[PDB]
Design a protein around this ligand. Sequence first.
Ligand SMILES: CCCCCCCCCCCCCCCCCCCC(=O)O[C@H](COC(=O)CCCCCCCCCCCCCC)COP(=O)(O)OCCN
Ligand SMILES: CC(=O)O[C@H]1C[C@@]2(C)[C@@H](C[C@@H](O)[C@H]3[C@@]4(C)CC[C@@H](O)[C@@H](C)[C@@H]4CC[C@@]32C)/C1=C(\CCC=C(C)C)C(=O)O
Ligand SMILES: CCCCCCCCCCCCO[C@@H]1O[C@H](CO)[C@@H](O[C@H]2O[C@H](CO)[C@@H](O)[C@H](O)[C@H]2O)[C@H](O)[C@H]1O
Ligand SMILES: CCCCCCCCCCCCO[C@@H]1O[C@H](CO)[C@@H](O[C@H]2O[C@H](CO)[C@@H](O)[C@H](O)[C@H]2O)[C@H](O)[C@H]1O
Ligand SMILES: CCCCCCCCCCCC
Ligand SMILES: CCCCCCCCCC
Lengths: 48, 144, 240, 240, 158, 457, 48
Amino acid sequence: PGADAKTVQDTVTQVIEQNMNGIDNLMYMSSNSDSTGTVQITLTFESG
Amino acid sequence: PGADAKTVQDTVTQVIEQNMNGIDNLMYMSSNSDSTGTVQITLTFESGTDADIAQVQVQNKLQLAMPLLPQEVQQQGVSVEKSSSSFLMVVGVINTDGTMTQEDISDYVAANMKDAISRTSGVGDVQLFGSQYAMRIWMNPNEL
Amino acid sequence: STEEFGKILLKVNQDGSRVLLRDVAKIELGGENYDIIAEFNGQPASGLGIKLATGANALDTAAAIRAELAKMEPFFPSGLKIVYPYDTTPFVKISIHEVVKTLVEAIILVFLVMYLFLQNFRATLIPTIAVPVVLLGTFAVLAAFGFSINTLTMFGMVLAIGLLVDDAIVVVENVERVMAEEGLPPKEATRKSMGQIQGALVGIAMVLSAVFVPMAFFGGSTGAIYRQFSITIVSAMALS
Amino acid sequence: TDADIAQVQVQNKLQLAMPLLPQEVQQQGVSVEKSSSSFLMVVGVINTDGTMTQEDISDYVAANMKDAISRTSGVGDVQLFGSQYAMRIWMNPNELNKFQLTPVDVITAIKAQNAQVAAGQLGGTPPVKGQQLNASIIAQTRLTSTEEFGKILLKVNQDGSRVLLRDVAKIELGGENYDIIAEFNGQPASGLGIKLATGANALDTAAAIRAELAKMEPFFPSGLKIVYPYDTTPFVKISI
Amino acid sequence: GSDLGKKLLEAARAGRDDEVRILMANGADVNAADVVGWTPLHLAAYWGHLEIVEVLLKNGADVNAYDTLGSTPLHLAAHFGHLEIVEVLLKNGADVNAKDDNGITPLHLAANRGHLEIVEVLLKYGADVNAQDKFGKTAFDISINNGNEDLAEILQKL
Amino acid sequence: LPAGATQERTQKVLNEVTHYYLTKEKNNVESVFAVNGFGFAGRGQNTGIAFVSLKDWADRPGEENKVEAITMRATRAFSQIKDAMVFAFNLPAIVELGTATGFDFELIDQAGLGHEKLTQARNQLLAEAAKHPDMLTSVRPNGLEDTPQFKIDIDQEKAQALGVSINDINTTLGAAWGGSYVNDFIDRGRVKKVYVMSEAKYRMLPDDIGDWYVRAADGQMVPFSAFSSSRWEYGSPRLERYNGLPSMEILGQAAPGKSTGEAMELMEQLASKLPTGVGYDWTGMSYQERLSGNQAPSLYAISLIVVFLCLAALYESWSIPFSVMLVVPLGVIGALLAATFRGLTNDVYFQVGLLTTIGLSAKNAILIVEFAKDLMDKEGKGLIEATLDAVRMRLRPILMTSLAFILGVMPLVISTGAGSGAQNAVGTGVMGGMVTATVLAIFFVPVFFVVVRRRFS
Amino acid sequence: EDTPQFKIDIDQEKAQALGVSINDINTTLGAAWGGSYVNDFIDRGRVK
Ligand SMILES: CCCCCCCCCCCCCCCCCCCC(=O)O[C@H](COC(=O)CCCCCCCCCCCCCC)COP(=O)(O)OCCN
Ligand SMILES: CC(=O)O[C@H]1C[C@@]2(C)[C@@H](C[C@@H](O)[C@H]3[C@@]4(C)CC[C@@H](O)[C@@H](C)[C@@H]4CC[C@@]32C)/C1=C(\CCC=C(C)C)C(=O)O
Ligand SMILES: CCCCCCCCCCCCO[C@@H]1O[C@H](CO)[C@@H](O[C@H]2O[C@H](CO)[C@@H](O)[C@H](O)[C@H]2O)[C@H](O)[C@H]1O
Ligand SMILES: CCCCCCCCCCCCO[C@@H]1O[C@H](CO)[C@@H](O[C@H]2O[C@H](CO)[C@@H](O)[C@H](O)[C@H]2O)[C@H](O)[C@H]1O
Ligand SMILES: CCCCCCCCCCCC
Ligand SMILES: CCCCCCCCCC
């Protein structure tokens, strides 16, 4: 709450993302950090 | 931080142990509480148990115990991990010209190396031997 | 920054002067903990403890890690060097190679022995074809069971090689004998020869299955190791 | 439905609610369970030599038996028919008002004087050069007895006298609650109401419970005895 | 810090009576001390090993040895309820009114943990009942604050 | 190092250990990774590990320059060291699995006895185990002993009298001496911790306690000396628990000549005469044996039955199978000879080698018996005639496989390079087993077949 | 079924007049009549 996109990215998004390593069947990871404090990190997996 | 073995045992270890209930296929549980402020509880499961299910069940029961632990322990965080202690390799990082301390090297590796190794193909997990920087305020009681 | 933390205001005195945090404390970027002192031949050190991902190729990963470390070389500060005190990949590269050498050498030895006794290039080819077919096929079954190429499964094949070699030799030899003793042509000789042994070979498969299959049903850590050899040998022997 | 996943998904959502809940609810411990509604068995506990009360037995069960049964695989939920002891401070309002004190003062002093302090070390890292001593500092530790809680100093009067906690409250070991009270054939008892975890085998879990109870029996106090007043499993074994 | 001094410290702690006997024969330093200033006698007094306390005093151990904070073997024995060692130490000339750096005596410690027998023994060997610590507290003050009925009756002999 | 020893003291030993490996083992050792502050038995200032990395296997020729040899020299060299238990040792084949030799015992507080009475019970158990060197060796705790610690008592009355809050006292003590994680900050776009702690020089010794001050309600600064008292006591630097109860782990192994099952059976007996409220349990490697112990015979009991039944169906005879089944020892003897000759062990590679040696010898016997039986059944030949004609026909294929397969495993026996331990264990048990299985079966199988057929007319 | 219950209204004005905190009122009422879990202690080695 109240945090800008960059502050949110540095304190939340990257911190979470650098722990999303060595998950099974991970194809790609996308994410975004915005001016309302919101982080969304979507991880898409191999078919099946 | 700064806790003796008994303080750790009686404020952290016992409280977590009392909440390790309703978890499937547990053979046995063991723990150590030591004078460097550390606790390690290991829960060993039956062979054939799904390790991910075993881990999430432990993790979930811990989360519900977190409000009972001390402020300082909640703040530091309690890590639940699978104990697959088998390194592929250890990459050492050293300083030959005497310009960097171990703390300086560890921070360089944290900031400019670790993440890229974590994202490398086939890499399951990466451990920093040391910590990234911390802002240290070394107090003087005479001046205070 | 350390400068900003130094400028933190703790109090303002009556006379006017300001007590800042740098007045009552030293301030620096340091470590989180100071319990561990790590050195490498006397010099300060840190490092990365890297683990292999589930189902990943250990040799590919090691090459890939070294490739990424190479891209980082140009940007290091003065004095910084990468070193490799522990690495299982050199050992794993040797273990697999020595097993592959043994399996190929075993096939040439059978060629040399087959020619020494039977004395024609034609017959000595038949095991040289049949043994690779069975070896390759075993890997397909290992893949189907979710097994990996590893020290245990590889030596499982080295231990199996005697059973594979024997199936090839027994079949060919027994045709060469039936041709020599009775004088029948290759096609009729093979029908008679296989008539003498086909019932036995099926019985041998069942008996050998009963020797090896129970080894898969051991419990715990010991039983996980025994199961690697069991599935590899039972698969190789069954294809043979 | 996979109950392991049902519990995970439910608990993922509960975790979003947790911070919004009152502090007091979080501190009692919220629990997510996957069990049958009906009791698998009741493990009763009595004292055949009448040496322990209903309250003593229940505490013994809670402190020495319940947790290990709760950790056993297949045990979905364990209901204690009774209460574990807690340190009960039974406040007196007349004596509280006599010394100008309230329940808020009692609570603050118990937090201040029944505390487990992390105090650091003599010669701790990072040390000065030439340090010879390294030793943990032990400051306040948790209180262990009614006597120690009794001598908690609430305040010191103007004339120098001391208001201890025992001067404004009766202090005793007693149930967390006093709601559940059980009897077996008229005599004092406690016990464990055990519910089968979703989809687990009743007979295997019962066997595991009876095995875990056998490990406890040798270290009971004098007279304490397990009784079996309700068990759904024996009919299954007898009917089959 | 001799070679046998360290082994006597460890042996006196562990209560290995036979190893102490041999170390007494070989001349192990009875006045050897930890970083914290504890002799073998301190260690034997703490962990309650009676035979070793007696053996060390026979071999010229300092009965009034003091650690880095002023505590003696009598402080340790009286505090941890080792009646036999308290009597033996007092018999071999232990300072019954010994004060540590806090002003705490063996009487204060014995009183604080309700060791009734020890408090009487200390009194019999001339313990000062009115001895105050750094906070002005007598052994009597400790007994009423702890709510010890029986102990308060004994110490009320001003 | 001993208990209470400092980081610097440990560093001096690690520097000495590193100096040895780079001087005395200069031709073997590539590097020494010294880690002051960590030991497997329990981390602390008084412990450390040096991970020694060697040069390539090509640059370390002969048995003298292997890990076995370098280990022994280093351990012998480091027996001199000024009060420090220092010793080198090789890693186990599977580091994931642990060392895995002997037993893993847990001594358990079952009735709220407490740390001190559990220590006494543990010492009682260890002293009793020491009186059976014939059964038990290296019976030791896998944990730390009690150490001196500085007990400080905050006086509540004097703190309330001077108007000093207990929170200010305990925060001043803990933050300075122990450190305190306050909050985070952002160093070059990365979130990182902020710690406040005392500068090293003001948190070293008991006299430094009195140099710390706390502000009272009235405004005056009060030193810790004004409202505290202190003393030395003993306490644990590593408290262990097992299944929720206080515990003490005890490692050990069976003595030379004895099995682990015997050693376990003794430790249980010695435990049953420990004080009231002291129980025990088996963990790790010992738990898995205690549960899955009766499998090895029970599985191969079925194996033997299925083998018999399969041969019975093949030959159409309840008796003839025995002629094949009697071959089993003929391979096993040579494997045991070749292993015992070279000083190798009864390991998994050897054991799987036995099963392959047995199976191939069984296969040879099956075909000898099959040929003999068909000659009797179809061509109407006599017992001895059919047996002699059978073994004649099967001599060549038996000798060919054996010649090839013995020569195939020949390099694995002589191998001394990288991964040679496993290769040796595979090779020797196969070679020696094949030599006896080949030589004996050709003469013994006809004996087995003839004896069986005569016995069962 | 519904049952009699003792409804009590804290007068906010009168409380503010006397200088009595509403937190001290509610803690007093709740702790005394309902009970209050303050913190933990150790009974024969076990956290309770
Ligand atoms: C514990 C859980 C339970 C597990 C279950 C285990 C089951 C294991 C399977 C065992 C099956 C064995 C069955 C054999 C039964 C004997 C049948 C033989 C009949 C017989 O006497 O043969 C005669 C010819 O003699 C001959 O030529 C000799 C043939 C007989 C040899 C006898 C030795 C049998 C060996 C089997 C035990 C060992 C197995 C393990 C290695 C003529 O026949 P007839 O029918 O005319 O006679 C009737 C006369 N009026
Ligand atoms: C002749 C020889 O030396 O073996 C070489 C040759 C080798 C057996 C190779 C491993 C593997 O590709 C082999 C397969 C079956 C791979 C799949 C197919 O495409 C085959 C057509 C191919 C033929 C032989 C080959 C190409 C070798 C290896 C192993 C390489 C691996 C490591 C870890 C060093 C080896 O060098 O030992
Ligand atoms: C006659 C037939 C007998 C059957 C023989 C069976 C062969 C079995 C051997 C193992 C097969 C796989 O072996 C394959 O080797 C190559 C070597 O180029 C590896 O390749 C990897 O290691 C090499 C060597 O360090 C790296 O340089 C390379 O970047 C990396 O990709 C593959 O990761 C592995 O998949
Ligand atoms: C539950 C499933 C597992 C049960 C275990 C089964 C084990 C059996 C091992 C394989 C035995 C094969 O069975 C065996 O086959 C061969 C031929 O191949 C038969 O041998 C016969 O074949 C044909 C049959 O028409 C005849 O013309 C010929 O004269 C003769 O040689 C034997 O009569 C039979 O005993
Ligand atoms: C009918 C003849 C072919 C029978 C197949 C024999 C191979 C069985 C392999 C068993 C592996 C478990
Ligand atoms: C061909 C079947 C071999 C028998 C294997 C034994 C299985 C045991 C399972 C309990």
